[PDB]
Design a protein around this ligand. Sequence first.
Ligand SMILES: [Mg+2]
Ligand SMILES: [Mg+2]
Length: 397
Amino acid sequence: TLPDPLVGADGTRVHDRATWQHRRRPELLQLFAREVYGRTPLGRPEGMVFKVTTMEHAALGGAATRKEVTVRFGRDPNAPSMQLLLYVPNAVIARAERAPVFLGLNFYGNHTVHTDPAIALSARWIPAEAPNGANHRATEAARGSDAQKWPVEQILARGYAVATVYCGDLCPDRPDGLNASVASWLDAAAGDQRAPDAWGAIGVWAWGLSRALDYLETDPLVDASRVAVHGHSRLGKAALWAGAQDDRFALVISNESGCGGAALSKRIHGETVARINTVFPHWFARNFRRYDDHEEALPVDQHELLALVAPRPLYVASAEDDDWADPRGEFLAVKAAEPVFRLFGQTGPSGEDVPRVNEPSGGALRYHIRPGPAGMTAQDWAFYLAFADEWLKSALP
Ligand SMILES: [Mg+2]
Ligand SMILES: [Mg+2]
């Protein structure tokens, strides 16, 4: 049984956009922070420094300008940093125009999103499952290893820049990774035990996405008011939490984000709260473990995280065979979030059951399910590019 997003914590009905934006949204953001992801301890830190390390105006055979940027989270050269890779379509900037952007984290390093041999190899810890890794270190053989999730050339040909950062720059995806992370520097309390409401990897990954947006605001080649933040699976959990917390993001795409992302936790289908916390104890707050095999006690569910994107366009998508993510749970979260989008005059999927494969449904709140297993395919990206065409042609007032 789901909590109503349009009934406030004190029982009062939310009938208007101002009550939603200025009372209900903060209420919900604090519940997710305390009980699920942990508290984001600060937004933009003082002293952000942006250093363009490489700049090639004829990348991808002339189709793109490629930028690599060190985004340091403080002015001292000893503060932590992340490495941002950016491809911008030369066709747009040759017209004296700023390109809209797709921004998303990657799983195995910037050098894996494209075979482009001029990308810096990540100098960070790489997980064991990464293709062609030599003892947790990037290798030349890993180049383009994950390019099937990154149709860079097609995205650029449709008029969008592509920005990415390796999630492991922010928090290595391993159970001890928070100790080697922004979190270890940022909320570096004198103590050692992680506090019960301290953020984990998803919170730290999300914060990195907002810091990448800070960089895009300074880059004259891109329009930072037209940024679609996207992610696949665990990095899609991060894209949703980033897009919910930071309403600068123009559009939000959740590709098969599953448990603790778009899927309802109270459905108890596929991956559950207990299973995700037991396998990935660093992803959520320790407080989220209160709900292991007790999802009935959750004071929110993930439809309210989706509602936190409203009125900005939100795309939630599933893969038919990806039962672990609970595709029907992701769809029903979209349906339970729709009344908030409707409050703002937007439309969600028509229907009470999962649509047929490869038949997207909904207006600014959109869903599709595609055939096959978990992944981020050319078919997913085709639907996202049409979505962005419709809801990200926003360079006019
Ligand atoms: Mg800009
Ligand atoms: Mg589930």
